[PDB]
């Protein structure tokens, strides 16, 4: 469960940080680690700006974590020795899920050091609590003086850039506070930023040390004191010169000064004998919360009890995919996977009655992706703001684990589609509103003031947590939870879209993932789903410009650099929903259908001038961030292509399976005719011609009347169709995209192509200002993985997939000295204006290395395809739990961003993981598993009932020696598979004998077959069975 | 003339800077010493944005010197010393106006370490000169293997947000050139910042080390190859583990790395031998004009004479104020003082005939002012922008120093006064600008290309040290230089006022002193 790295000073370097998770009704606090040193760099509560160790960058933490992080040191009988300094001193590193501990066993003094670390949970104060035990090895008894601490403790009101720009001139506002009471307040003496409403400061960064009674030690907040003249901080001359008891007595600067934190105490060990040092570093509002939090004495039972708290969090967090294999590193990867999924997409839970809550969010950032700007919000009910992606891809299975969610995801990520099909980047915290009248009748058995200060502050969006901290400020310590609860209850859901800052091209097609996932675990409720009118619709906050607006003139020729119409852009903080009535009435209410064919028609729309990809029209590139430049170089997009065309085969056939009855919107309707007029008038030519020039334009045309209408605002009037006149639409559309398909691999090669770029030699200027194309120049691109990856998402022939699979393993796509995929082939031909990709070293970063995302969708989509002997070797080579940690270079229970590729030019770097754990592939691997685990469709309607059975894919390496491989369904339900022999279990090659329930309430029930329907089915889903015992081809196992 | 202090390393901390003097014909830098360590902790060429070695303020300064500053490792008979690590070892400042000298006397070790370091003067190539000599003091003959440099060689590109901020991330722009031909060549692959008109980057951080003889050794751009494992810099472990031999064989990583720049020989030492090594370390704005350097070998004796002129060109400067009196302590204050004020607010000169131009002056900062942003001028001729009051104050003096300025200062601070009596915040560069027929009669014994380009050149608005640039340019090697005189005497003073921020109550009434000064 423990990853365990010997003498990790001389490995290879790697970030890392701590989860952040303080429980449900704790602060949580970020903190940074790497594998030097006291391995702990940088820590603060809220953001970069309320950080109390000083944040890095991760070659500065390298760099620095050995005098600016954590410090500790020994004086036996005079000498004195630092542990964790010394990389030849027998070291040693145990991660845990939430929690570290480093060791040390230097022989030559006979002492063991010891510190363990770990997120203070379950408090209303952010803090770190570090534990430093060290213990007499020797035989004989040692006089021992220990000092321990930071060196650097970051005063409140100092921001970031304050330090690292002007840190000398910083340390005049510096001072530290209240040292004879042993907690002392680090804090600025006045606001740094001048001209700001209120000078004083309130807040603060604290440091409080104890032993095992809990009395309180005296500080050392003057560095000078223990380094005397070495500012380097890398020697402590005044602690060699002096005892620690003459240290104590001296008259330290609290002021003028860069404040440190120390602890000293002077023991005699008998041999044997250890002393242990518990010591809390955190940040409050006030000074108040501080004093309250230390009314009662911290003793070390409360440390410990704390630490077996942070423990149970993250067991409990991810108890919900527990696994049982033949390797116990899969295991333990499983867990830590669907936590950082968690970390990055958010927790979900039922908060009240009525109330779907994601907690644990957070806007990532760490000592490698140092350019985000990271926030965690330091409350009760934690949570964060993220990018509409990320948000949309980590949730694609929630539904699975987390029943009680619904269709909630969906609603979320479909009424954030707007009328010209993107969407805002941003999708912001969950918060909510009470209304006057409900305020006023739910606060009726309040007292007055105190009702008045609710009615106040519950009248404006609010969080979870600032309520309940709220809550807590207005009763004193004593108050009735089910108030709280009742005012979420009857609380209302704000909007939560921000734009950002552009229009990418590949955001909607992650959307069909949700309604798959859902349609798995509930099958039945599919024309429900259809046909809910539910689905808002968010506000533009811009336009896309017009084609012939978008294109401008330069040095190297025609250039699409005016993607967005600035004249048409709209207030950020305003209206964030469209109203019928052009603004004016009520709120413009949806369909899930109508939703499905907006997007297909407007995609549909969004064809090239050849009718292969999708325009990047949004100034932005797709999945790819590394290309940054391909928009302004015409480029579109296969892989939006690709998608198109699973999107419009699933509503082909959603709408032939539920006849009847659809309402579109006025202009969508005006839109959708006038595009299957032109797709009748231009079939013929489609089918013959090359270039596509007058489609494209008649298209083009019809999208923007559509756009610039809808733009200005919709009057709400509907219009009525068949499923079967939507059919025969969205079948032409498709029939047209399927020969673009065919025409764009007629034209790439034995590999589908992802991108592609067009030149525009002959162009025509306008009266208005505008140029208009007349000729389209399409240019070959670099083979890309996505472009397989979404290819085989289309329901093509086996045979051709595993031609595919074929090509792409024999191309430059694989790596074959790491037996990796790639993500992309060479770049070193094409043009240099595509964007930062061209600017990177190849196999470093997104060129052309090994990155983990990618690479995890194509081995689902070979899964997926039923490509089940390739799907297990390449899963066997590539996985994370199976790497070899001395070239992984990190924990192999953690995932990375990419993997360096045989192509970097360090041939140490090969083969080695850089970024941190919250790379996109953890979801792709939770699918994995759950499709290995229990199939692709657990739940099926057969005969208008509910029908349950078990698909396993279980390769013969997952396999334990008895045979008994077990997981968690739902997260509740335990499936306890019996194999005959040692094997791979492919679908169709055994049979499920029998299968054996046992009841919550304790009663058995048996099913000799392969499936269940009815009552055991809608019971299993329910969550009222607690393991099932599955014997899958044989009634015991067989050696 | 010299202040020497001894066991500076145990002292208080102090910062202090270089005066970037370059000469009148020289490209000054920017580089701030504090006493710790090998003293020298940050330099670069223009600005924070343009440094060599990372810019730190003086807290960071006196943190990070021993680490990030100049290091130096001494293998005698297999054990490695590191001169200027320990406080303990008698060790030694002597600060010169325009020069800066350090030692070390390790008599466990029987060895003794000088370096001494100054700006380049008098070439068209910015760059700071370090010379590092170690002296066999024991009995007996020892096998030295010397290694000494910059572990952190900021490439050019790389903006000082982009370090503190994201280094990590920057890493992937990061590259060194021309390892083999033995100058080392430091920037970035593209231009860091997206949305760039221009794509490549020319400019680049250079450096190059040499004995006595002037062949360029065989430079080391991976901090990995000697300190192995070891992030912090702290101890060589590659070094100490493998002969000096066997590291200059490896394949060092010229790519993805925040480079260093290690010279390295191997000696056998005789009783009361030493070796010396000059380094040298600057910034280029293209290969071109770093070829053009080193077309002529740099040898021992070019490096004393650059020396000397460095110490002459303070000398010179301050010779002006010289004085004799009973406390040498004094003369030597006068002197430095009358520096920090040409420093400060610029050294008046005869530049041509009929105009009066301020060289050596910039906008200042330090590594304690770091609040400022500093701005010296890579060029020719070199000034800067100033404050109001600054300049002001500054200049109170210049007549009696310099009769020829006359009334010139007075008139620049009263011309500047509004008519509602407030005054600009910024006093700009002085920048002179030729009228189209002028240039035309001035330019009738050119060739015609020639006469074309400093036409277009000479029209807008330039500083003296971009229009001798531009001669050299496009002259090639020689020309005349009473054509750059007679295009100075014949050409037009811009006026030079910058608003700036706001309006102070005081500014105005520092011009009554420029006028009894002209009046006394």
Same mark, same amino acid.
């Given at each position: 469960?423990?990853?365990?790295?010997?003498?990790?000073?001389?490995?290879?370097?790697?970030?890392?940080?701590?989860?952040?998770?303080?429980?449900?009704?704790?602060?949580?606090?970020?903190?940074?680690?790497?594998?030097?040193?006291?391995?702990?760099?940088?820590?603060?509560?809220?953001?970069?700006?309320?950080?109390?160790?000083?944040?890095?960058?991760?070659?500065?933490?390298?760099?620095?974590?050995?005098?600016?992080?954590?410090?500790?040191?020994?004086?036996?009988?005079?000498?004195?020795?630092?542990?964790?300094?010394?990389?030849?001193?027998?070291?040693?590193?145990?991660?845990?899920?939430?929690?570290?501990?480093?060791?040390?066993?230097?022989?030559?003094?006979?002492?063991?050091?010891?510190?363990?670390?770990?997120?203070?949970?379950?408090?209303?104060?952010?803090?770190?609590?570090?534990?430093?035990?060290?213990?007499?090895?020797?035989?004989?008894?040692?006089?021992?003086?220990?000092?321990?601490?930071?060196?650097?403790?970051?005063?409140?009101?100092?921001?970031?850039?304050?330090?690292?720009?002007?840190?000398?001139?910083?340390?005049?506002?510096?001072?530290?506070?209240?040292?004879?009471?042993?907690?002392?307040?680090?804090?600025?003496?006045?606001?740094?930023?001048?001209?700001?409403?209120?000078?004083?400061?309130?807040?603060?960064?604290?440091?409080?040390?104890?032993?095992?009674?809990?009395?309180?030690?005296?500080?050392?907040?003057?560095?000078?004191?223990?380094?005397?003249?070495?500012?380097?901080?890398?020697?402590?001359?005044?602690?060699?010169?002096?005892?620690?008891?003459?240290?104590?007595?001296?008259?330290?600067?609290?002021?003028?000064?860069?404040?440190?934190?120390?602890?000293?105490?002077?023991?005699?060990?008998?041999?044997?004998?250890?002393?242990?040092?518990?010591?809390?570093?955190?940040?409050?509002?006030?000074?108040?919360?501080?004093?309250?939090?230390?009314?009662?004495?911290?003793?070390?039972?409360?440390?410990?009890?704390?630490?077996?708290?942070?423990?149970?969090?993250?067991?409990?967090?991810?108890?919900?995919?527990?696994?049982?294999?033949?390797?116990?590193?899969?295991?333990?990867?499983?867990?830590?996977?669907?936590?950082?999924?968690?970390?990055?997409?958010?927790?979900?839970?039922?908060?009240?009655?009525?109330?779907?809550?994601?907690?644990?969010?957070?806007?990532?950032?760490?000592?490698?992706?140092?350019?985000?700007?990271?926030?965690?919000?330091?409350?009760?009910?934690?949570?964060?703001?993220?990018?509409?992606?990320?948000?949309?891809?980590?949730?694609?299975?929630?539904?699975?684990?987390?029943?009680?969610?619904?269709?909630?995801?969906?609603?979320?990520?479909?009424?954030?589609?707007?009328?010209?099909?993107?969407?805002?980047?941003?999708?912001?915290?969950?918060?909510?509103?009470?209304?006057?009248?409900?305020?006023?009748?739910?606060?009726?058995?309040?007292?007055?003031?105190?009702?008045?200060?609710?009615?106040?502050?519950?009248?404006?969006?609010?969080?979870?947590?600032?309520?309940?901290?709220?809550?807590?400020?207005?009763?004193?310590?004593?108050?009735?939870?089910?108030?709280?609860?009742?005012?979420?209850?009857?609380?209302?859901?704000?909007? /939560? !879209?921000?734009? @950002?800052?552009?229009?990418? #091209?590949?955001?909607? &097609? +992650?959307? *069909?993932?949700?309604? %798959?996932? =859902?349609?798995?675990?509930?099958?039945?409720?599919?024309?429900?789903?259809?046909?809910?009118?539910?689905?808002?619709?968010?506000?533009?906050?811009?336009?896309?410009?017009?084609?012939?607006?978008?294109?401008?003139?330069?040095?190297?020729?025609?250039?699409?650099?005016?993607?967005?119409?600035?004249?048409?852009?709209?207030?950020?903080?305003?209206?964030?929903?469209?109203?019928?009535?052009?603004?004016?009435?009520?709120?413009?209410?949806?369909?899930?259908?109508?939703?499905?064919?907006?997007?297909?028609?407007?995609?549909?729309?969004?064809?090239?001038?050849?009718?292969?990809?999708?325009?990047?029209?949004?100034?932005?590139?797709?999945?790819?961030?590394?290309? /940054? !430049?391909?928009? @302004?170089?015409?480029?579109? #997009?296969?892989?939006? &292509? +690709?998608? *198109?065309?699973?999107? %419009?085969? =699933?509503?082909?056939?959603?709408?032939?399976?539920?006849?009847?009855?659809?309402?579109?919107?006025?202009?969508?309707?005006?839109?959708?005719?006038?595009?299957?007029?032109?797709?009748?008038?231009?079939?013929?030519?489609?089918?013959?011609?090359?270039?596509?020039?007058?489609?494209?334009?008649?298209?083009?045309?019809?999208?923007?009347?559509?756009?610039?209408?809808?733009?200005?605002?919709?009057?709400?009037?509907?219009?009525?169709?068949?499923?079967?006149?939507?059919?025969?639409?969205?079948?032409?559309?498709?029939?047209?995209?399927?020969?673009?398909?065919?025409?764009?691999?007629?034209?790439?090669?034995?590999?589908?192509?992802?991108?592609?770029?067009?030149?525009?030699?002959?162009?025509?200027?306008?009266?208005?200002?505008?140029?208009?194309?007349?000729?389209?120049?399409?240019?070959?691109?670099?083979?890309?993985?996505?472009?397989?990856?979404?290819?085989?998402?289309?329901?093509?022939?086996?045979?051709?997939?595993?031609?595919?699979?074929?090509?792409?393993?024999?191309?430059?796509?694989?790596?074959?000295?790491?037996?990796?995929?790639?993500?992309?082939?060479?770049?070193?031909?094409?043009?240099?204006?595509?964007?930062?990709?061209?600017?990177?070293?190849?196999?470093?970063?997104?060129?052309?290395?090994?990155?983990?995302?990618?690479?995890?969708?194509?081995?689902?989509?070979?899964?997926?395809?039923?490509?089940?002997?390739?799907?297990?070797?390449?899963?066997?080579?590539?996985?994370?739990?199976?790497?070899?940690?001395?070239?992984?270079?990190?924990?192999?229970?953690?995932?990375?961003?990419?993997?360096?590729?045989?192509?970097?030019?360090?041939?140490?770097?090969?083969?080695?993981?850089?970024?941190?754990?919250?790379?996109?592939?953890?979801?792709?691997?939770?699918?994995?598993?759950?499709?290995?685990?229990?199939?692709?469709?657990?739940?099926?309607?057969?005969?208008?009932?509910?029908?349950?059975?078990?698909?396993?894919?279980?390769?013969?390496?997952?396999?334990?020696?008895?045979?008994?491989?077990?997981?968690?369904?739902?997260?509740?339900?335990?499936?306890?598979?019996?194999?005959?022999?040692?094997?791979?279990?492919?679908?169709?090659?055994?049979?499920?004998?029998?299968?054996?329930?046992?009841?919550?309430?304790?009663?058995?029930?048996?099913?000799?077959?392969?499936?269940?329907?009815?009552?055991?089915?809608?019971?299993?889903?329910?969550?009222?069975?607690?393991?099932?015992?599955?014997?899958?081809?044989?009634?015991?196992?067989?050696?």
């Amino acid at each position: 469960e423990t990853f365990v790295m010997d003498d990790y000073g001389k490995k290879s370097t790697f970030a890392s940080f701590l989860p952040g998770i303080a429980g449900i009704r704790g602060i949580p606090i970020w903190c940074y680690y790497v594998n030097r040193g006291q391995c702990v760099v940088s820590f603060g509560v809220d953001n970069k700006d309320h950080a109390i160790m000083e944040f890095y960058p991760a070659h500065q933490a390298y760099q620095n974590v050995k005098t600016t992080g954590f410090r500790t040191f020994l004086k036996k009988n005079g000498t004195v020795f630092e542990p964790f300094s010394d990389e030849n001193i027998t070291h040693r590193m145990q991660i845990h899920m939430n929690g570290l501990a480093i060791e040390e066993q230097n022989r030559s003094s006979g002492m063991d050091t010891k510190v363990v670390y770990y997120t203070l949970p379950g408090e209303n104060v952010g803090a770190l609590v570090r534990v430093v035990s060290v213990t007499n090895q020797s035989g004989e008894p040692i006089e021992l003086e220990l000092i321990d601490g930071m060196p650097a403790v970051i005063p409140y009101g100092v921001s970031m850039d304050s330090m690292k720009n002007m840190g000398q001139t910083a340390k005049a506002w510096m001072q530290v506070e209240d040292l004879s009471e042993g907690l002392p307040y680090y804090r600025v003496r006045a606001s740094m930023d001048d001209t700001a409403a209120v000078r004083r400061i309130d807040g603060g960064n604290f440091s409080a040390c104890c032993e095992a009674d809990g009395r309180r030690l005296q500080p050392i907040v003057d560095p000078s004191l223990i380094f005397s003249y070495d500012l380097s901080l890398k020697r402590p001359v005044g602690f060699e010169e002096r005892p620690l008891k003459e240290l104590l007595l001296e008259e330290q600067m609290t002021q003028n000064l860069l404040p440190c934190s120390f602890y000293g105490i002077t023991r005699t060990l008998a041999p044997g004998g250890s002393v242990t040092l518990y010591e809390l570093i955190g940040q409050v509002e006030n000074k108040q919360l501080l004093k309250e939090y230390f009314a009662e004495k911290k003793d070390a039972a409360y440390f410990e009890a704390k630490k077996r708290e942070a423990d149970e969090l993250a067991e409990a967090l991810t108890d919900g995919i527990r696994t049982r294999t033949a390797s116990a590193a899969f295991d333990a990867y499983c867990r830590y996977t669907y936590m950082d999924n968690v970390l990055r997409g958010g927790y979900p839970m039922q908060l009240g009655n009525n109330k779907i809550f994601y907690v644990y969010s957070r806007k990532h950032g760490d000592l490698e992706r140092d350019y985000n700007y990271f926030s965690m919000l330091p409350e009760f009910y934690s949570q964060g703001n993220g990018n509409f992606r990320d948000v949309n891809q980590n949730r694609r299975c929630d539904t699975f684990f987390a029943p009680f969610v619904g269709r909630k995801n969906i609603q979320e990520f479909y009424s954030l589609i707007q009328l010209d099909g993107y969407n805002p980047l941003g999708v912001e915290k969950l918060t909510y509103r009470l209304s006057k009248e409900r305020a006023k009748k739910l606060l009726t058995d309040v007292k007055e003031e105190q009702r008045s200060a609710l009615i106040d502050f519950a009248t404006k969006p609010f969080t979870p947590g600032a309520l309940c901290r709220k809550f807590g400020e207005v009763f004193g310590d004593t108050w009735d939870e089910t108030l709280f609860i009742r005012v979420i209850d009857f609380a209302e859901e704000m909007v /939560n !879209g921000s734009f @950002g800052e552009g229009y990418w #091209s590949d955001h909607w &097609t +992650y959307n *069909l993932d949700l309604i %798959l996932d =859902y349609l798995s675990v509930f099958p039945e409720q599919e024309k429900e789903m259809l046909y809910e009118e539910v689905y808002t619709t968010f506000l533009s906050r811009i336009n896309v410009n017009r084609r012939f607006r978008r294109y401008v003139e330069t040095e190297n020729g025609l250039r699409q650099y005016r993607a967005l119409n600035e004249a048409s852009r709209r207030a950020a903080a305003a209206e964030k929903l469209v109203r019928t009535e052009y603004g004016s009435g009520d709120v413009l209410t949806m369909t899930l259908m109508e939703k499905l064919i907006l997007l297909g028609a407007v995609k549909f729309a969004t064809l090239d001038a050849y009718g292969m990809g999708i325009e990047m029209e949004g100034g932005k590139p797709g999945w790819y961030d590394a290309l /940054n !430049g391909m928009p @302004g170089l015409f480029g579109s #997009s296969m892989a939006e &292509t +690709y998608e *198109l065309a699973r999107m %419009l085969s =699933y509503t082909i056939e959603a709408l032939k399976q539920y006849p009847g009855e659809v309402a579109l919107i006025e202009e969508l309707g005006c839109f959708l005719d006038e595009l299957n007029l032109i797709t009748r008038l231009e079939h013929d030519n489609i089918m013959r011609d090359e270039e596509l020039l007058s489609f494209w334009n008649r298209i083009n045309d019809a999208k923007e009347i559509y756009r610039d209408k809808t733009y200005q605002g919709v009057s709400g009037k509907k219009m009525v169709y068949h499923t079967e006149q939507l059919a025969a639409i969205l079948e032409g559309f498709l029939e047209i995209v399927t020969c673009g398909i065919k025409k764009a691999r007629r034209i790439s090669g034995e590999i589908c192509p992802t991108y592609f770029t067009y030149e525009v030699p002959e162009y025509e200027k306008l009266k208005d200002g505008g140029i208009r194309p007349l000729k389209f120049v399409p240019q070959n691109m670099p083979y890309f993985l996505e472009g397989p990856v979404r290819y085989l998402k289309l329901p093509v022939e086996q045979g051709e997939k595993r031609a595919l699979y074929e090509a792409v393993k024999e191309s430059d796509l694989y790596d074959g000295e790491l037996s990796m995929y790639k993500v992309n082939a060479s770049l070193a031909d094409s043009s240099f204006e595509l964007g930062r990709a061209r600017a990177f070293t190849p196999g470093w970063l997104e060129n052309e290395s090994i990155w983990l995302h990618m690479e995890y969708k194509y081995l689902l989509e070979l899964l997926r395809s039923g490509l089940y002997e390739e799907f297990f070797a390449d899963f066997k080579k590539a996985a994370i739990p199976f790497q070899n940690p001395e070239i992984y270079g990190r924990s192999i229970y953690e995932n990375s961003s990419f993997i360096a590729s045989s192509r970097n030019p360090n041939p140490s770097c090969r083969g080695r993981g850089f970024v941190a754990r919250l790379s996109g592939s953890t979801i792709e691997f939770i699918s994995m598993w759950k499709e290995m685990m229990f199939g692709a469709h657990p739940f099926r309607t057969e005969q208008e009932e509910l029908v349950f059975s078990l698909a396993p894919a279980i390769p013969a390496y997952l396999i334990p020696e008895d045979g008994r491989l077990s997981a968690a369904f739902m997260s509740k339900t335990t499936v306890c598979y019996e194999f005959g022999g040692h094997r791979d279990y492919v679908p169709g090659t055994y049979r499920i004998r029998h299968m054996v329930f046992f009841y919550e309430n304790g009663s058995q029930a048996t099913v000799e077959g392969e499936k269940v329907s009815g009552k055991l089915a809608e019971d299993i889903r329910a969550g009222r069975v607690r393991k099932m015992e599955v014997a899958v081809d044989l009634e015991h196992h067989h050696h």
